[PDB]
């Protein structure tokens, strides 16, 4: 299976007074492992997973230097983009950035990403070949030109195919006990009468990791989407995830309906029957 390392950055201008609010978070797959918040006292990159605490002071000194530098880049960008879009100094605006790399089952580089948004819309993104850029509008063409002239893509690709992968490999090894452990969903079904004649069947998947999962109902062995309901996958708060799907059925006919669960942690999909 592949694994990913992603950093997410959000910068929000506060025109009234002072510099933007800057928040950076780092993830391996679905596990957050580092954070920086401009409003926090430490003014340091901080650990958020036990396995990153293995890294010594030089690591934190290094990441802190870079993340502070990232925050300045975003503060400058907010100024620049306000100018491109002819906006007032009065409003608050947002830049968002996400970059990172995947390795495959062979633990070699698989994919790299670098994308940038302004006010919640695409602005500029590195293409899958890591050699060129996609600009969403004419303002972004300016940035594209500048980055082409400065050969940003070449420097980015070197990081993504090199440093990025190498550290991802390190984190995976250091955090193997959790990062490389799949937690299959604990599944069960609840039953609620909604009348004398109808009941709700709810199929629950709990305590699973990673987040990706598929939960579906079948009736007499064919998929059923009508009269169903299904919540978005949500964090339990202990590092795992939760999901449920529900169906309304005539009382007494429950045996026709089966819940099917697919997850990386299951060698074979699960089929639950209301007994």
């Amino acid at each position: 299976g592949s694994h990913s390392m992603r950093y997410f950055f959000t910068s929000v201008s506060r025109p009234g007074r002072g510099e933007p609010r800057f928040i950076a978070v780092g993830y391996v797959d679905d596990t957050q492992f580092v954070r920086f918040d401009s409003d926090a006292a430490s003014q340091r990159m901080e650990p958020r997973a036990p396995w990153i605490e293995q890294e010594g002071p030089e690591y934190w000194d290094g990441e802190t230097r870079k993340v502070k530098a990232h925050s300045q880049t975003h503060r400058v960008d907010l100024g620049t983009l306000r100018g491109y879009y002819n906006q007032s100094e009065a409003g608050s605006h947002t830049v968002q950035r996400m970059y990172g790399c995947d390795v495959g089952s062979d633990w070699r580089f698989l994919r790299g990403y670098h994308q940038y948004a302004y006010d919640g819309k695409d602005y500029i993104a590195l293409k899958e070949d890591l050699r060129s850029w996609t600009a969403a509008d004419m303002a972004a063409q300016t940035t594209k030109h500048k980055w082409e002239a400065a050969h940003v893509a070449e420097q980015l690709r070197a990081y993504l195919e090199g440093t990025c992968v190498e550290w991802l490999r390190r984190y995976l090894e250091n955090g193997k006990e959790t990062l490389q452990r799949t937690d299959a969903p604990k599944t069960h079904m609840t039953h609620h009468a909604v009348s004398d004649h109808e009941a709700t069947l709810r199929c629950w998947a709990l305590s699973f990791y990673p987040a990706e999962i598929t939960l579906t109902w079948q009736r007499d062995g064919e998929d059923q989407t009508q009269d169903t309901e299904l919540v978005e996958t949500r964090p339990a708060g202990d590092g795992t995830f939760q999901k449920w799907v529900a169906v309304v059925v005539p009382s007494g006919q429950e045996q026709r309906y089966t819940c099917h669960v697919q997850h990386e942690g299951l060698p074979k999909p699960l089929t639950l029957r209301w007994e």
Binding site: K66, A69, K146, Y159, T163
Partner: peptide, 9 residues
């Protein structure tokens, strides 16, 4: 690990 430097837009 973070990238060492980001160019301005």
């Amino acid at each position: 690990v973070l990238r060492d430097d980001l160019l301005e837009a």
